[PDB]
Amino acid sequence: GTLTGERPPVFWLQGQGCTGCSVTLLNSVHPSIADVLLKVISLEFHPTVMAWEGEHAIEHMRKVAEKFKGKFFLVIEGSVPVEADGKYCIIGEANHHEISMVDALKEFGPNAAAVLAVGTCAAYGGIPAAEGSETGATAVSKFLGDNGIKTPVVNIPGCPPHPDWIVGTVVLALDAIKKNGLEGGLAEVVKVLDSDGRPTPFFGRNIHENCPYLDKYDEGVMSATFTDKVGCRYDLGCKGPMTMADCFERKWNGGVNWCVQNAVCIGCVEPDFPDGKSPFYQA
Amino acid sequence: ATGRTTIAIDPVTRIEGHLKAEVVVENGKVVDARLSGGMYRGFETILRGRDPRDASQIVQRICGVCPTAHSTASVLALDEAFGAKVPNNGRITRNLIFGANYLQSHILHFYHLSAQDFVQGPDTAPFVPRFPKSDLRLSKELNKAGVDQYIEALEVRRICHEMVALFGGRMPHVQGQVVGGATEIPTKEKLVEYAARFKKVRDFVEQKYVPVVYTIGSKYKDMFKVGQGFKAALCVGAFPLDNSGKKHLFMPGVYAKGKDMPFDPSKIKEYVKYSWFAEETTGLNYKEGKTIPAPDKAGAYSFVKAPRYDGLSLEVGPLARMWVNNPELSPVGKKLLKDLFGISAKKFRDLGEEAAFSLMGRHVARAEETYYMLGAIEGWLKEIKAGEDTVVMPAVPASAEGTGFTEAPRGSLLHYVKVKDSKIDNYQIVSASLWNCNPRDDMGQRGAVEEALIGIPVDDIQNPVNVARLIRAFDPXLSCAVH
Ligand code: SF4
Numbered sequence: 001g002t003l004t005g006e007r008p009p010v011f012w013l014q015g016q017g018c019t020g021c022s023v024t025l026l027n028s029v030h031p032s033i034a035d036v037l038l039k040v041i042s043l044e045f046h047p048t049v050m051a052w053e054g055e056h057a058i059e060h061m062r063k064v065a066e067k068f069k070g071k072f073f074l075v076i077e078g079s080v081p082v083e084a085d086g087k088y089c090i091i092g093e094a095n096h097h098e099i100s101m102v103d104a105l106k107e108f109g110p111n112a113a114a115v116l117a118v119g120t121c122a123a124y125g126g127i128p129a130a131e132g133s134e135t136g137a138t139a140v141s142k143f144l145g146d147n148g149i150k151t152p153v154v155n156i157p158g159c160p161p162h163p164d165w166i167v168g169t170v171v172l173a174l175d176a177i178k179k180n181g182l183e184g185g186l187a188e189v190v191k192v193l194d195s196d197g198r199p200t201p202f203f204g205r206n207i208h209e210n211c212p213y214l215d216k217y218d219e220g221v222m223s224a225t226f227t228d229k230v231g232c233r234y235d236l237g238c239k240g241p242m243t244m245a246d247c248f249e250r251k252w253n254g255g256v257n258w259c260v261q262n263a264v265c266i267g268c269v270e271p272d273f274p275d276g277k278s279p280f281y282q283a
Numbered sequence: 284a285t286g287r288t289t290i291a292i293d294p295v296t297r298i299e300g301h302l303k304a305e306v307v308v309e310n311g312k313v314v315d316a317r318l319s320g321g322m323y324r325g326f327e328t329i330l331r332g333r334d335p336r337d338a339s340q341i342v343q344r345i346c347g348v349c350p351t352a353h354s355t356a357s358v359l360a361l362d363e364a365f366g367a368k369v370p371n372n373g374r375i376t377r378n379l380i381f382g383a384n385y386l387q388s389h390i391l392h393f394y395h396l397s398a399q400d401f402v403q404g405p406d407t408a409p410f411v412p413r414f415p416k417s418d419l420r421l422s423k424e425l426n427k428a429g430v431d432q433y434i435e436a437l438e439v440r441r442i443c444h445e446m447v448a449l450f451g452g453r454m455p456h457v458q459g460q461v462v463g464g465a466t467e468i469p470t471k472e473k474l475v476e477y478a479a480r481f482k483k484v485r486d487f488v489e490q491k492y493v494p495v496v497y498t499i500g501s502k503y504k505d506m507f508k509v510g511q512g513f514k515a516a517l518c519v520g521a522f523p524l525d526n527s528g529k530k531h532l533f534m535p536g537v538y539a540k541g542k543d544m545p546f547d548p549s550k551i552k553e554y555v556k557y558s559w560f561a562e563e564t565t566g567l568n569y570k571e572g573k574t575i576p577a578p579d580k581a582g583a584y585s586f587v588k589a590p591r592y593d594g595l596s597l598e599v600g601p602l603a604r605m606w607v608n609n610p611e612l613s614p615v616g617k618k619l620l621k622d623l624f625g626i627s628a629k630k631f632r633d634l635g636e637e638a639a640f641s642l643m644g645r646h647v648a649r650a651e652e653t654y655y656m657l658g659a660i661e662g663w664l665k666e667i668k669a670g671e672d673t674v675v676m677p678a679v680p681a682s683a684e685g686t687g688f689t690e691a692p693r694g695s696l697l698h699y700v701k702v703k704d705s706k707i708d709n710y711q712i713v714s715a716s717l718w719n720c721n722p723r724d725d726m727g728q729r730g731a732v733e734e735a736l737i738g739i740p741v742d743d744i745q746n747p748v749n750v751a752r753l754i755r756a757f758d759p760x761l762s763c764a765v766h
Pocket residue numbers: 207208209211212213214215217232233234238239240241260265
């Protein structure tokens with residue numbers, strides 16, 4: 001990229017998120033986040049990092065949205081709670097009217113080029129939708145479908161995702177769009193999504209079948225304490241067998257570690273996370 | 284003289300999470316304030332019925348900026364409930380995991396959240412558009428230094444997360460802290476890797492971050508004269524320095540009405556009159572806490588409960604800890620206080636109560652604390668024993684309770700767990716931005732930030748920049764506050 005290159009507008013809306021999907025993106029190594037923001041995308045609205053505030057920030061997003069109707073990318077971090085008329089997530093106020101996450105996704109969703117549901121909360125409901133919750137936490141694709149909004153959705157799950165999955169999916173899409181235009185490009189992206197809406201370059205391979213401890217698993221050699229790094233982690237709760245992600249290769253935080261080496265995989269990219277992956281510390 | 288203008292700001296940006304601030308301005312000053320935490324998930328009910336060990340993963344998803352704090356409070360609560368005796372080397376490893384995120388979080392806060400309050404960024408989103416009169420006072424050279432350091436700090440904070448992940452597995456959301464200790468014994472080789480990254484962070488903190496806070500502060504001296512609020516603080520202790528449970532890097536204490544007092548956690552109660560929870564749950568200590576949402580309750584204006592300490596509304600965070608503990612100031616800080624402010628100071632309290640409890644004082648306290656944490660981390664790198672076991676494997680109890688107390692980067696954090704039939708019966712969280720960003724209690728007494736907004740200058744109602752500047756000095760995290 002260059003400082004003077006083409007950079008599409010992006011709005012980043014936080015529903016029932018924890019900001020960890022924004023933070024994970026800040027950890028991108030190459031390209032660095034500075035390069036992403038200055039050379040790849042134009043991040044026009046993001047509540048955690050943008051200069052302006054309040055109704056002025058909302059109106060700025062609305063002005064960009066009008067200018068780029070059908071052409072901006074909408075990132076959603078967190079689930080969308082539908083109970084209590086949307087009141088469990090208020091994202092702003094303008095014209096003396098509060099704006100719920102429900103309202104915001106009904107407003108901007110129809111006019112985005114594509115919605116990127118970043119993180120397991122946005123993609124699948126995640127922890128806010130888990131047993132014991134009461135907010136009607138809803139995944140982005142389901143909310144949009146329930147409301148008749150046909151905009152394409154790409155899921156980039158994980159709790160959090162690896163930065164490379166987020167940046168890499170953006171790069172995938174922008175490449176396809178450069179080659180084929182917007183609709184042709186998004187069609188090429190959709191072709192490489194699995195049945196859970198995830199890009200197969202990052203989510204097409206199983207952790208366990210590629211795990212360095214697979215021989216120990218097959219031998220029945222299981223660690224009995226977390227600090228035994230020789231044995232397989234299955235008896236300690238590892239969910240690698242049921243998890244589709246490339247962490248075994250890419251690892252985390254500049255390659256310094258990953259969940260299976262350090263402790264166990266908890267299946268954080270999967271649609272049933274957390275309840276279908278729990279208890280975390282037994283098989 | 285001018286009359287009243289009422290200003291609502293939603294979203295307050297360059298914080299974490301969902302906050303509306305509404306202030307009443309009369310004659311150029313804020314005279315009233317209300318803070319609304321706008322997003323609820325209900326972790327305290329989601330956790331019920333689970334294997335207690337799951338909590339130390341689930342709770343981190345309260346906040347991906349400070350997940351190591353929730354991890355720490357949770358594993359401490361589980362350790363107590365399970366009777367787990369963390370090995371000495373695991374105590375130290377936990378301190379290395381968590382301490383690295385203090386460095387990350389304070390650097391993120393000053394540069395990537397706060398610095399745009401004082402620095403004009405590059406002429407492209409997300410640095411523009413902004414208020415036409417943003418009161419950005421720095422010279423071209425100093426403004427450029429701010430931008431250059433913002434950019435360098437993006438790499439430095441990322442390196443801090445590599446430090447967290449070396450023994451923590453990944454970040455956000457560590458895998459490496461569990462009941463019974465830490466899941467990965469530090470090796471000689473990985474301790475070299477941690478130290479090499481730590482050196483780069485130390486150099487940035489010492490040469491760039493601490494100096495820039497005092498230097499920018501010296502161009503905004505008026506910001507030491509506002510934002511006092513109650514001048515009341517809480518610290519619950521954090522970073523145990525031995526296995527006794529009685530000695531910590533930050534020792535506990537309360538400060539209010541000009542007086543130091545001990546910290547007794549039984550004096551904490553959470554009020555809900557002005558919060559969206561059922562009225563019958565008001566006034567509960569966390570050991571009996573209840574979380575029953577009431578989003579339509581009349582008169583309420585926040586999903587944050589109102590915690591009070593023996594009736595007092597207190598603030599938390601670096602200022603609170605540094606005031607309570609009164610450490611020696613950094614060499615840089617002593618020099619720049621003299622050179623740029625004409626202040627002769629040796630220990631933190633030598634700033635004086637008024638300047639410490641101020642908008643800019645909170646930024647200074649956070650920079651000083653970052654420097655202070657360098658020495659703690661250096662000490663732990665000398666104390667850790669490569670190869671020595673860091674975890675025990677305790678059986679899950681059928682019936683138990685435990686409380687974990689620590690200090691998240693933004694202030695005091697406790698988690699309480701009650702186990703029955705080997706499952707979570709209750710789990711209650713009392714977090715840092717809960718103490719700071721809460722609404723009125725049942726007696727109408729404001730929360731700490733609400734009160735600190737009183738007196739904030741708004742000389743231009745069309746560019747009311749100091750409202751959110753004050754809020755940002757507290758480094759809010761509304762996802763922590765509400766959970
Ligand atoms: S169970 Fe986990 S540690 Fe064992 S081989 Fe499979 S992915 Fe690896």
